[PDB]
């Protein structure tokens, strides 16, 4: 499947139990189309390229 990734898991004891910690790198790699949508919405980039 697309829009999927792996990594090693560590422990975060500050989270509330409906939360997880997602690396910024993985988050940016998995959510690219949503970021394109928002970028073109804000006008920060006209064309997709």
């Amino acid at each position: 499947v697309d829009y999927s990734g792996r990594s090693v898991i560590t422990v975060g004891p500050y989270l509330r139990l409906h939360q997880c910690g997602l690396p910024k790198k993985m988050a940016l790699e998995l959510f690219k189309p949503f970021i394109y949508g928002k970028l073109e919405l804000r006008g920060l980039a006209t064309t997709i390229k």
């Binding site: 990734g5 898991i9 409906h18």
Partner: protein, 50 residues
């Protein structure tokens, strides 16, 4: 570079922190987001089904 997982949900996964890995998937459509928020959210799964 590592996913931070809550301590309490580790029993459900049977996961310790000595080298285990985890895969993360993104729901795209709106009904999949509702299903994740309503059926699969970790605050709904406090009792076992067994």
């Amino acid at each position: 570079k590592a996913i931070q997982l809550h301590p309490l949900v580790c029993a459900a996964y049977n996961a310790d922190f000595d080298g285990d890995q985890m895969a993360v998937h993104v729901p795209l459509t709106l009904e999949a987001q509702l299903e994740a928020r309503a059926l699969m959210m970790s605050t709904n799964n406090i009792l076992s089904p067994a």
